[PDB]
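User: For a teaching handout, I'd like to show students what a predicted protein-ligand complex looks like in token form. I'll give you the sequence and the SMILES for calcium ion. Please answer with just the structure.
Assistant: Understood, here is the input followed by the structure.
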Amino acid sequence: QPAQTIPWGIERVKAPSVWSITDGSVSVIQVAVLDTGVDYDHPDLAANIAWCVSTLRGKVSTKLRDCADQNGHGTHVIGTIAALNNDIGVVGVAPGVQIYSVRVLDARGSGSYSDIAIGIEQAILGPDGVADKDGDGIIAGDPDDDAAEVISMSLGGPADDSYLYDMIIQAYNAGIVIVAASGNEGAPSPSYPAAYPEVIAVGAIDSNDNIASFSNRQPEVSAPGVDILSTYPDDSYETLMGTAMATPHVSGVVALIQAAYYQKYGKILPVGTFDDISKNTVRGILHITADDLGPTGWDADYGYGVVRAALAVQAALG
Ligand SMILES: [Ca+2]
Ligand SMILES: [Ca+2]
Ligand SMILES: [Ca+2]
Ligand SMILES: [Ca+2]
Ligand SMILES: [Ca+2]
Ligand SMILES: [Ca+2]
Ligand SMILES: [Ca+2]
């Protein structure tokens, strides 16, 4: 295996200086990544893989072969969130965060809407299949449950499916932060599910801090999405580009906020809303600590700006 390198995007979102506070290894926190599957035994991933599930064709299955990445995309996205900080490969934004790999996309990267809807439900129910096992009314941020705190969706399309949208509303109202790619058509507004008001739409910058021209406009925040090196099957590494690559940077920063807030207070922040500019919710903190590029304030290119984990966490803890 090759010696560890830090991909430029990990440095760009200011993640490494947070790790001494937390690398996301606060046991209550998990990130669900709804994608093509994962290379579950990849040496730079395996120890962070808490659950590997499939919802393809209606069936929930944890058979390894059912849950394994047959495309490469999911393994790449997951390594950007949580590739381990060790002597090999790469390193994620939250290199100690627990991952749920929820395969909702086939070998080609296509998914049906009820498969993705079911994926969202699985992220809430978690490996034990029960939402609120101890009946205390708390799901996200409850160490007695195994619900994810972040659902990351590096996928999207022009289609708005109400069944999937209902699942999103359920997760959001459970206190789960939802993050998704704005899309790759240079379009005037984000694909769904990014375009849902409950969801953080993520646009893609390059290494010069320019918005990538394929990045769909009107995102909520933006993140590294060009020349992104991460993990790839089989026990390998590969470089990809797209708002799918920017998304996991934002999910990692969210995992760091919630892990650091929990470590200090014994609880997590509310998700918040698009318009939030206070330090009282996850999204408010993302918006006000982002590097504001382009026109001052929120803009159609960068949204609120480039996410910055070191400032986000400082805002969350102060
Ligand atoms: Ca949890
Ligand atoms: Ca492997
Ligand atoms: Ca590594
Ligand atoms: Ca559960
Ligand atoms: Ca509970
Ligand atoms: Ca509890
Ligand atoms: Ca701006």
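For the handout, you might add this sentence: The pocket of calcium ion (ligand 6) is lined by residues 134, 136, 138, 142, 144 (CB under 6 Å).
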